[PDB]
Design a protein around this nucleic acid. Structure first.
Ligand SMILES: [Zn+2]
Length: 149
DNA sequence: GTGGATGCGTGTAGGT
DNA sequence: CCTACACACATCCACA
């Protein structure tokens, strides 16, 4: 893992993309490799072309959580593959969806644990009460057309 | 290790 | 709607 970084300007501020050649390791908000370019492209699309987003290639993930099966990995995967743009799901819904229905709260942890936010929409996961750096979650949701309250 | 403590949840229940 | 509470549960953390 000979680490590589790169920072991209976004509506949210400065996103620092870091990963190796075997994939993206992490997307982090502050305020030369392919999985990095793919991710940069993808992120740009998400911000200025959410229509053709499903067209841009998802970068390869190489963060340790993505190096072996873990409930947390199952979740993050399910979440990315199932819940698409503009949609939302509740912790428990995802929990069951991932396999474990009673792991609603664990899923919350999995969300806290996501190393690649925005790419892996952990913002699209809300409370089964409809309830929703909170600013950013709300900004992403607004960007995906959601109401307030 | 193991074992208890932890938290981005949720349904039930009563109170304002 | 809101504080209170009981519970289920993958991780984390400190101690052995
Ligand atoms: Zn790597």
């Amino acid at each position: 893992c000979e680490m590589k970084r790169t920072t991209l300007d976004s509506p949210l501020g400065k996103l620092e993309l870091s990963g190796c050649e075997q994939g993206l390791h992490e997307i982090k908000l502050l305020g030369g490799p392919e999985p990095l370019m793919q991710c940069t492209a993808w992120l740009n699309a998400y911000f200025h072309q959410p229509e053709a987003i499903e067209e841009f290639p998802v970068p390869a993930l190489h963060h340790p959580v993505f190096q072996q099966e873990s409930f947390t990995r199952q979740v993050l995967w399910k979440l990315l593959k199932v819940v698409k743009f503009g949609e939302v799901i509740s912790y428990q819904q995802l929990a069951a969806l991932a396999g474990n229905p009673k792991a609603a709260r664990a899923v919350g942890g999995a969300m806290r644990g996501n190393p690649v936010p925005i790419l892996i929409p952990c913002h699209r996961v809300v409370c089964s009460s409809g309830a929703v750096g909170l600013a950013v979650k709300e900004w992403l949701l607004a960007h995906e057309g959601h109401r307030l309250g």
